[PDB]
């Protein structure tokens, strides 16, 4: 009833990486290592790096799923709010209910779990291009953390799983996400509160 969020590098040394985008008030996506938390604007590009120590087998995939961070909400499926699920901002592939989309990858698949009813988006695990040491997936988050009737100000985590071709676990990592109007200011504020 609750997906695991335990960090697990596995046999391939799987882990995420994030750019260093800063906290200017204009920034659209920014990652806080101190908070392990990504702050982003609605529907803007969120680059997430995938790092491995060795190449996983052909057919390996990478899945993203959101859960509520607070235990008392963790069994509730994270979905878009009653407004956003109806705003016809379809990209042609993502169901309108799904919070997390993958940008610019026609091989992305969206799953509505027949048992848990949770949403996820999965793509094939690509090898780095020549001259590159990692691969990057571009995610979009399609509701604000504040959306009423949806996340409703509750924080979420995104869980990224490296999977084999059967969907078995190879690796796992995660990060908190806040989708908000001013990620730079909010990151600064929360890092200050932590200090
Ligand atoms: Zn919304």
Swiss-Prot record:
Effect of residue 81 to F: In sporadic cancers; somatic mutation
Protein name: Cellular tumor antigen p53
Reported impact of residue 183 to L: In LFS; germline mutation and in sporadic cancers; somatic mutation
Effect recorded for residue 48 to G: In sporadic cancers; somatic mutation
Shown chain mapped onto the complete sequence: 96 to 290 of 393
Outcome when changing residue 15 to S: In a sporadic cancer; somatic mutation
Consequence of changing residue 174 to N: In sporadic cancers; somatic mutation
Outcome after substituting residue 149 to C: In sporadic cancers; somatic mutation
Effect upon mutating residue 73 to V: In a sporadic cancer; somatic mutation; requires 2 nucleotide substitutions
Localisation: Cytoplasm; Nucleus; Nucleus, PML body; Endoplasmic reticulum
Reported effect, residue 82 to L: In sporadic cancers; somatic mutation
Effect of residue 150 to R: In sporadic cancers; somatic mutation
Consequence the record notes for mutating residue 52 to G: In sporadic cancers; somatic mutation
Effect of residue 165 to P: In sporadic cancers; somatic mutation
Result for mutant: residue 168 to I: In sporadic cancers; somatic mutation
Outcome (variant: residue 142 to R): In sporadic cancers; somatic mutation
Effect of residue 28 to N: In a sporadic cancer; somatic mutation
Effect of mutating residue 159 to M: In a sporadic cancer; somatic mutation
Effect of residue 36 to K: In sporadic cancers; somatic mutation
Gene this chain is encoded by: TP53
Outcome recorded upon mutating residue 156 to M: In LFS; germline mutation
Effect caused by changing residue 96 to L: In sporadic cancers; somatic mutation
